[PDB]
Amino acid sequence: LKIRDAYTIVTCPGRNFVTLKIVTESGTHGIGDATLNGREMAVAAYLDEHVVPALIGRDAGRIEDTWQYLYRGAYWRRGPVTMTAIAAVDMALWDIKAKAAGMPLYQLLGGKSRERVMTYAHCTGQTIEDCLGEVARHVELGYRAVRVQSGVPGISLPAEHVWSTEKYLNHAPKLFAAVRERFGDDLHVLHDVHHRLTPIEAARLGKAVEPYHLFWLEDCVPAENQESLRLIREHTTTPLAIGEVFNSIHDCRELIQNQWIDYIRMPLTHGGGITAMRRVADLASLYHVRTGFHGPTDLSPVCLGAAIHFDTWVPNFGIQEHMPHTDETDAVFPHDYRFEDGHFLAGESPGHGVDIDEELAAKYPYERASLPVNRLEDGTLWHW
Amino acid sequence: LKIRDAYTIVTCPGRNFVTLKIVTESGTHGIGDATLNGREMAVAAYLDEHVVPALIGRDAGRIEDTWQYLYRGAYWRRGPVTMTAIAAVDMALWDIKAKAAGMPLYQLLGGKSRERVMTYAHCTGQTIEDCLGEVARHVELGYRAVRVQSGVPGSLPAEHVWSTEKYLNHAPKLFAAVRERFGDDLHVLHDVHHRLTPIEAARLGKAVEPYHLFWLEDCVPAENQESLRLIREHTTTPLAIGEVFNSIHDCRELIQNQWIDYIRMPLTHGGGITAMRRVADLASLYHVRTGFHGPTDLSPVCLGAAIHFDTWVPNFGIQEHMPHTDETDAVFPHDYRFEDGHFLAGESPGHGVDIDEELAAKYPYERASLPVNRLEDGTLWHW
Ligand SMILES: O=NC(=O)[C@@H](O)[C@H](O)[C@H](O)CO
Ligand SMILES: O=NC(=O)[C@@H](O)[C@H](O)[C@H](O)CO
Ligand SMILES: [Co+2]
Numbered sequence: 001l002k003i004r005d006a007y008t009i010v011t012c013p014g015r016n017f018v019t020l021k022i023v024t025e026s027g028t029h030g031i032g033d034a035t036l037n038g039r040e041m042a043v044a045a046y047l048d049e050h051v052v053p054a055l056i057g058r059d060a061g062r063i064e065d066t067w068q069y070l071y072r073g074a075y076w077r078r079g080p081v082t083m084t085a086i087a088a089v090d091m092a093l094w095d096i097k098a099k100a101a102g103m104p105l106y107q108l109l110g111g112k113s114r115e116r117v118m119t120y121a122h123c124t125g126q127t128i129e130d131c132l133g134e135v136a137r138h139v140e141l142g143y144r145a146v147r148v149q150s151g152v153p154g155i156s157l158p159a160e161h162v163w164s165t166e167k168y169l170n171h172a173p174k175l176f177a178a179v180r181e182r183f184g185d186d187l188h189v190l191h192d193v194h195h196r197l198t199p200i201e202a203a204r205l206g207k208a209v210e211p212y213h214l215f216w217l218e219d220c221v222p223a224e225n226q227e228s229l230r231l232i233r234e235h236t237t238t239p240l241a242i243g244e245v246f247n248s249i250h251d252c253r254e255l256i257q258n259q260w261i262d263y264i265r266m267p268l269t270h271g272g273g274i275t276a277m278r279r280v281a282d283l284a285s286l287y288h289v290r291t292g293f294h295g296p297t298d299l300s301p302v303c304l305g306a307a308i309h310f311d312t313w314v315p316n317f318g319i320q321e322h323m324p325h326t327d328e329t330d331a332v333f334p335h336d337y338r339f340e341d342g343h344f345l346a347g348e349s350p351g352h353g354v355d356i357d358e359e360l361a362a363k364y365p366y367e368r369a370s371l372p373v374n375r376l377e378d379g380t381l382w383h384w
Numbered sequence: 385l386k387i388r389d390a391y392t393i394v395t396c397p398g399r400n401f402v403t404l405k406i407v408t409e410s411g412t413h414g415i416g417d418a419t420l421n422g423r424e425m426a427v428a429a430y431l432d433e434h435v436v437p438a439l440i441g442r443d444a445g446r447i448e449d450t451w452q453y454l455y456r457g458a459y460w461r462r463g464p465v466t467m468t469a470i471a472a473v474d475m476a477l478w479d480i481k482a483k484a485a486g487m488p489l490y491q492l493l494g495g496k497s498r499e500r501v502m503t504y505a506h507c508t509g510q511t512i513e514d515c516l517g518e519v520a521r522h523v524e525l526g527y528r529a530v531r532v533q534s535g536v537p538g539s540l541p542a543e544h545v546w547s548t549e550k551y552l553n554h555a556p557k558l559f560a561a562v563r564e565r566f567g568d569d570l571h572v573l574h575d576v577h578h579r580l581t582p583i584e585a586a587r588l589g590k591a592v593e594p595y596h597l598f599w600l601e602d603c604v605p606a607e608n609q610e611s612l613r614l615i616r617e618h619t620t621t622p623l624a625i626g627e628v629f630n631s632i633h634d635c636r637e638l639i640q641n642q643w644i645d646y647i648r649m650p651l652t653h654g655g656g657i658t659a660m661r662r663v664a665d666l667a668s669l670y671h672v673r674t675g676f677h678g679p680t681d682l683s684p685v686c687l688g689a690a691i692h693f694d695t696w697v698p699n700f701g702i703q704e705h706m707p708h709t710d711e712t713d714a715v716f717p718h719d720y721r722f723e724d725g726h727f728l729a730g731e732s733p734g735h736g737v738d739i740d741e742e743l744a745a746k747y748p749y750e751r752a753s754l755p756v757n758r759l760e761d762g763t764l765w766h767w
């Protein structure tokens with residue numbers, strides 16, 4: 001069937017989401033997430049002005065050709081704006097394909113590899129003690145895995161944060177020791193370094209946290225230069241995760257083939273969608289690398305639903321990040337995935353199981369919001 | 385030097401251009417090119433909606449902090465939309481800094497390294513003979529170097545058909561014919577334009593060795609930088625690449641492994657003066673030279689800035705020149721000059737280019753997309 005219409009919806013039910021909807025001549029439709037936190041309107045414009053017009057009249061079934069057509073045909077390849085636009089088309093087309101097949105997406109991908117999908121929750125606190133409090137209540141909700149963060153003692157437009165690597169490196173290991181002491185060894189414990197360290201500093205932290213056996217240490221260092229990971233890998237056996245800021249298999253091909261990481265984090269909506277992420281997950285699996293999808297509030301329920309289908313099929317699934325959306329957001333994007341006892345159960349409706357309530361979306365207009373920046377104590381613009 | 389206002393101007397004097405203007409409290413102003421061919425409005429929105437608001441009240445003198453603030457601060461780093469926005473801010477700020485120094489841009493960068501800037505012109509025809517005709521008229525205009533392309537016998541993106549096999553048997557004939565008619569002193573360039581695999585490019589490289597091309601450009605898509613290795617190992621024809629690149633991380637390995645002779649990434653797509661200086665300096669460690677992409681889809685803002693850059697950079701190779709239309713030149717008044725095949729940098733403070741806003745408003749945006757390429761069986765290929 002041919003594409004009859006395509007358009008974007010921008011809405012802000014708690015925060016900004018951009019969605020692409022594709023409608024075939026028969027009236028069937030699918031949607032894809034296009035949300036890029038803090039640069040939302042770049043993608044919306046990419047879609048509205050440059051992609052949407054070229055979609056009209058194309059065969060909706062040609063997912064692969066459409067992917068190559070937009071990826072190669074853009075001429076300027078890769079990039080967060082570019083690949084998020086491409087991902088949103090791709091997700092919308094897989095939705096349509098699964099619908100046309102009368103199957104939930106995970107079936108169309110090759111069927112289930114697991115009965116449920118393990119997640120992790122964010123647990124954040126100013127003091128180590130405050131964080132311990134959040135772990136407890138998330139454990140009470142059934143989470144088997146938690147990502148822990150505390151403050152560091154002595155420390156619409158972008159907020160500006162101040163950062164000290166040295167104080168942080170001295171403090172962080174104390175948090176994990178406290179986590180193990182209170183909660184024991186069976187809990188999976190994750191930590192997000194969030195781009196702030198140099199490699200040798202990350203090597204040092206990894207070694208210092210070996211006794212607490214983290215499920216992963218994430219985003220140790222900025223990794224545009226993929227060799228940045230080598231010194232870390234050579235000095236510690238703490239498992240490493242990276243990639244939420246990546247958008248292309250070429251951002252991580254060497255990290256994977258050289259075995260510098262244990263989990264790849266690039267998610268569906270930023271990583272060129274289902275079509276591309278299958279390739280990424282498959283390359284990862286030759287080297288024992290597992291999936292750990294970025295799943296913050298700034299990817300919509302459209303992505304999450306699709307992510308849960310993918311998580312359900314993919315052989316080398318690792319863990320799915322879960323930052324729960326607001327009630328308002330869950331209402332804009334009705335969905336049939338379920339959360340029970342710390343795990344996701346994939347939906348059984350044909351498609352990725354997510355839709356968008358356009359009328360409700362129109363009640364919440366766009367509100368500009370930017371991500372923070374980080375500066376060192378001397379005012380040096382650092383990595384947030 | 386606080387920024388009072390910043391905004392974009394979109395205009396289509398023969399083709400689409402997006403320009404960023406920044407204006408400080410004291411009234412001094414600067415402009416940067418933000419044109420991304422076929423995706424123009426993505427950059428416009430990136431700038432208008434996410435960058436501009438954050439520029440207001442910033443110290444315009446803090447060029448480096450602004451670059452890092454936009455680069456790191458975006459969180460999602462690199463990419464053609466991202467780095468074009470960043471390049472526009474950066475070029476506009478260097479414009480302001482040069483004006484404040486009362487110097488033309490090249491003086492600010494370390495001064496003149498050459499007296500003029502050699503260019504090459506495009507020479508295209510349907511048959512070899514049509515192309516040789518174009519080569520003649522461009523030599524007559526004074527060009528010392530020509531990029532030659534001929535046809536191969538046998539609002540939305542246009543759709544072209546392509547045959548690698550027919551191209552590889554045909555292309556070396558073009559170069560033989562150019563040498564037969566024009567001799568050995570003319571510099572002859574060729575743009576493969578992404579269509580080949582590495583071993584196919586290796587073959588073509590070897591076939592054209594007797595013709596001594598100035599460069600063979602964009603042999604293979606190079607998101608995977610290792611794609612250049614088989615070519616380099618099999619031919620001594622010089623290799624050029626990078627017009628579709630936007631980061632030093634797109635070509636760091638290409639340079640350090642000595643897989644290329646000329647880096648093509650231009651100011652407007654390569655993060656501006658601040659980033660391209662660093663790329664140029666990495667390249668110089670390995671004898672790699674600059675060969676800035678210079679088509680009609682980069683504005684005269686970029687061209688003037690590029691000519692200043694070309695004038696200072698030690699490892700200059702060549703500057704591509706596709707003449708802009710008269711309407712375009714009128715929208716973007718400038719003090720660079722073209723004479724006898726070469727550019728001469730302007731002497732006005734700044735990069736020497738301005739935009740005439742009243743004139744620009746007379747040419748509204750018109751959507752135009754780059755073509756796609758398909759193989760004979762329908763395969764969506766590289767254009
Ligand atoms: O692993 N999750 C994270 O690092 C998030 O909290 C990110 O800072 C935001 O999603 C940025 O859009
Ligand atoms: O070397 N020059 C070229 O390859 C040009 O003809 C490009 O296809 C266009 O500028 C793309 O925007
Ligand atoms: Co993270």
Ligand SMILES: [Co+2]
Nearest residue numbers: 575601602627
């Ligand atoms: Co080219």
